[PDB]
Amino acid sequence: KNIQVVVRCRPFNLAERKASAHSIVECDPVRKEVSVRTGGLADKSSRKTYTFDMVFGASTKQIDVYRSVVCPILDEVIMGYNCTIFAYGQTGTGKTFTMEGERSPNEEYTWEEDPLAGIIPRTLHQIFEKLTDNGTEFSVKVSLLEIYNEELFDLLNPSSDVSERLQMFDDPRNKRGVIIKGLEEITVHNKDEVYQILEKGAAKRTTAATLMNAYSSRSHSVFSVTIHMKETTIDGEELVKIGKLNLVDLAGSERAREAGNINQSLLTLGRVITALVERTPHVPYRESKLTRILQDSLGGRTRTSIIATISPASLNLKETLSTLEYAHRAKNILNKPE
Ligand SMILES: Nc1ncnc2c1ncn2[C@@H]1O[C@H](COP(=O)(O)OP(=O)(O)O)[C@@H](O)[C@H]1O
Ligand SMILES: [Mg+2]
User: Fold this and answer.
1) CA-CA 20 to 30 A from 16: which of 85, 131, 236, 319?
2) Helices (H) and strands (E) in the chain, counts
3) Is residue 92 annotated as involved in ligand binding?
């Protein structure tokens, strides 16, 4: 499939140690399996096993997630296609760590990416590297919005109130596309401007949370990079390729209809991915804002990836199984024997 579904388990953490929680998740990257202990202390043997396209255990470094998951997708984006990577899972399991990452406790400027850097900085690093290394005329722009309770908020506009809702227009160029009027798109001339853009977005997220209770754990974040590529033929024709990569940090998978329409928006996304995997005619793109925004990138002739993030702690057994169930319903991968 052009649809890859992978699972990442993060290390057991302090908040989980506090509660005398036990470790219940075992990852087998070679067999691409996740086994979860299902019986608690009274039955430590019973387990439930899932199989995915890739499995990343607690020791997985950021660079290996990038190389395994993003590199093939970025290669297609650079050929002029529109792709999407999602991070899905319970709050606190590592969607933002995977999507954004963290920087060095030492502030010194380096050109290599931080070992803790996530998909977003690494993607921008490789875009500028790949395209400078082969002499292509190119420009890069990025946008960052937040979907909270089915409403769209611009996280990068320097000059508008973050609480101003954004409207979606039809796109006369493409029946699959949408134009988000007023969405700030910032040109990136060098790999480092990305870090300043992520800081601006983080400040806007805090304001949105203070103003509207639009907490990032309850919102879908959509970081979109658009690469505009130009080559001039021998006889002087300018050919334009346009690649787009959407890096989506979904709302936590765990009010009411605030929380309800979170679950419905995520279920709609799940139904879209399942229909794309099964090649069924009815893909419900139009039934949520998230899938409307991403419809032009999800069509079928592109690579899509879902990184399902989970906790290894007994405290989160129910949501871990719910996340694995969601990932398995998105793409039915059967268990091998022995
Ligand atoms: N693979 C990992 N290794 C080390 N720390 C992690 C990992 N994944 C998540 N964390 C840490 O766990 C905390 C919660 O992760 P976060 O990305 O905020 O979860 P989410 O975005 O899914 O709510 C953060 O402090 C983050 O640094
Ligand atoms: Mg997060």
Assistant:
1) 85
2) 9, 14
3) yes
